[PDB]
Design a protein around this ligand. Structure first.
Ligand SMILES: N[C@@H](Cc1ccc(O)cc1)C(=O)O
Ligand SMILES: N[C@@H](Cc1ccc(O)cc1)C(=O)O
Lengths: 334, 334
């Protein structure tokens, strides 16, 4: 053709969500465990559970074995602290916002720039199934309408940022996701985008995505009742008590019940791993001081540091310190 | 299902690109016309055609009749300046840059929050076909891997921004597009993203999109040889002679022959319509003083003024004045 596919040499129909799930299905036990973790995170966000939601893990998943080692250490740490903190392992296969670099375990699993999406999807789903069998709740970030259909049944929490809310085809996708959702503030620091997205997510909507057969589809949503804001900083950090108070005020003026998670990383640490514990400790001080809107923390943490990810030893010490400082000023708030 | 589509109430398969094009096919005259306008734009970008490429039109399309009214004036003006300026009408249905508001003619053609994408696609393609039959080359912006399959056969030029380059599944989509492509600089003013994307677009690549049957597919690309940079400001405008010289320097240092278009709007006018003409005039001055890299202009222009769109009268006066000023210096470059 003179106009169509002039610069396309080949086209290959991808494996569908149907086929991926049939090749790597969930067991009844795994399904029940995931539903229960989603319910627990919903209860925490809604204030019915006193514990603090801690989404912690690597900046981006590198390979299955390292992720499993981190998961072993993380589950070990979580069993000791779960009476005050609900640890959820973030499994991000890719990093937002790059013109450059490795495309991640799903797109380039062989790590040679070959773009083998189909093998990456199977590797990722197998790894996620293994993580679920370890008893770990998993956290993701929604960046497109396709990956929820392939892998969303394995996650208990999702972050929503500008890649969703600034599209028009699927800006309302959060209202149709089966998991609790946290809405990141604007890159400039605007809370309005996150607040509007959180309010809209509780309502029925329609968006363009795919069906289980990999076909472009129009989806009608029911509304997602489990939403909260994520404070991740803008040009300047926004975790301070004054910024938290401003967030609570803007949420209350929107008619929402103030519920927010503090990202200790990117915009509140300014890309430096050394600042994350300071943000976490400021949040702990605020919770001690009768703050009730802060429902969770986000922490970027690898086995080693240096990346804005803190080392595993720092993560262990920090989570233990938070648990010791958060004695029962969290049962105080139910 | 207790895990899948909990908050989804309905799902229907959207009309495929195949079916859309079967319902609203291109006549062979329009096909040859679009191919010829693509070739002419490619010639301008490569420096074979001395004329200046001018992409100009509404901030976004409001409804079909307003678009047609604009189009008749724009075609009339294009006829009278066609020896020096090659006019291309920008037809942007979606806006980038929002989380609230009207979803545009494609998603909400009834403009009542209905999200009737299937009717919007047909209305949009009907409008585009009528615009093509008026003899107007058309310009779009690629914000999505699916909309090119539905409507790209009607466009002669496409802008490429962060929505493409800062995804990791279709970051190379431009290398597989059948039309010349302009790469916008980063929001911060960084030229590296646009330059790297422009270089990568000339190479064979792979990206995830859809086939003509609406199925998720992996596309292998041949490479797109018709690329240029779009200067659209950052934290400050970047159209000045010093900024253009720096862009030339960075492009040459990347191995690219300097070829750029100056956006007289968003970052370069500070979203103040009153400043758009000055920008354009500056570009004119630079060409009169020996510039060889500036190949085009982009102008946001509607029937009425202030949106940072300029009025049609401002547009007409500005384009005529540019045409008067440019006559001889353009053939002297090639
Ligand atoms: N299946 C997803 C919802 C969804 C459906 C279609 C999509 O394209 C994206 C997401 C869930 O249960 O959360
Ligand atoms: N059909 C487009 C190329 C394309 C193919 C698949 C996509 O998902 C997107 C774009 C063109 O000819 O320009």
């Amino acid at each position: 053709d003179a106009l169509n596919n002039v610069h396309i040499t080949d086209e290959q129909v991808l494996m569908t969500p149907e086929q991926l799930k049939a090749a790597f299905p969930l067991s009844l036990q795994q399904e029940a465990q995931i539903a229960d973790s989603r319910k627990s995170i919903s209860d925490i966000i809604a204030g019915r559970d006193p514990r603090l939601l801690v989404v912690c893990g690597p900046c981006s998943i590198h390979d299955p074995e390292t992720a499993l080692e981190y998961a072993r250490r993380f589950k070990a740490l979580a069993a000791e602290v779960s009476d005050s903190l609900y640890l959820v392992m973030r499994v991000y296969f890719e990093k937002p916002r790059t013109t450059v670099g490795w495309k991640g375990l799903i797109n380039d699993p062989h790590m040679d720039g070959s773009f083998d999406v189909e093998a990456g999807l199977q590797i990722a789903r197998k790894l996620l199934l293994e993580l679920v069998n370890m008893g770990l709740p998993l956290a993701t970030e929604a960046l497109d309408p396709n990956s929820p259909q392939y892998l969303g049944d394995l996650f208990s929490w999702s972050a929503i940022g500008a890649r969703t809310t600034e599209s028009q085809t699927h800006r309302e996708m959060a209202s149709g996701l089966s998991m609790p959702v946290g809405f990141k503030n604007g890159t400039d620091g605007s809370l309005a985008t996150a607040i509007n997205a959180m309010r809209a997510a509780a309502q029925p909507h329609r968006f363009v995505g795919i069906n289980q057969a990999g076909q472009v589809a129009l989806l009608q949503t029911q509304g997602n009742p489990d939403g909260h804001v994520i404070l991740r900083g803008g040009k300047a950090p926004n975790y301070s008590p004054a910024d938290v108070a401003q967030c609570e005020k803007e949420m209350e003026q929107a008619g929402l019940r103030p519920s927010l998670m503090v990202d200790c990383s990117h915009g509140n640490s300014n890309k430096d791993y050394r600042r994350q514990p300071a943000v976490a400790e400021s949040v702990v001080a605020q919770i001690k001081d009768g703050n009730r809107s802060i429902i969770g923390l986000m922490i970027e943490s690898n086995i080693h540091e240096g990346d804005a990810c803190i080392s595993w030893e720092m993560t262990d010490a920090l989570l233990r310190e938070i648990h010791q400082d958060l004695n029962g000023q969290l049962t105080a708030r139910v």
